[PDB]
Amino acid sequence: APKASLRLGFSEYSRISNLIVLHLRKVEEEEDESALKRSELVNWYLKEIESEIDSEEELINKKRIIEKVIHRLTHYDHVLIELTQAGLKGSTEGSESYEEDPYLVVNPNYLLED
């Protein structure tokens, strides 16, 4: 059904979300769960689409969406998975966490349609 949406209307969303499911299913097929890919996920993404991105606007938009999605994924969507808690949860005890996030992995479930 066309009214269902989330098929072509949101090209940026579909283009970004596909990166998550495709890259995850690929690595789980190889190993199981690579994890640890905050900047890496965006990094390879940009390097893959940079050839089709002939306009600065596109890149800025793609990076905005990819970043927003990851940020949402780790919060609003809450489809992210982490091993520990005390090493990734700021405030309360006043954890350091100045280096980087311990373990970061995403659930292949999500809430997209496509």
Added chain:
Amino acid sequence: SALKGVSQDLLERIRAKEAQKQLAQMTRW
């Protein structure tokens, strides 16, 4: 070209990208 560059760290790569498509003609022949 854009207001409030989201994630300057990831977007900084664009400052060099703009130069790339500047010296190299990407215009479809």
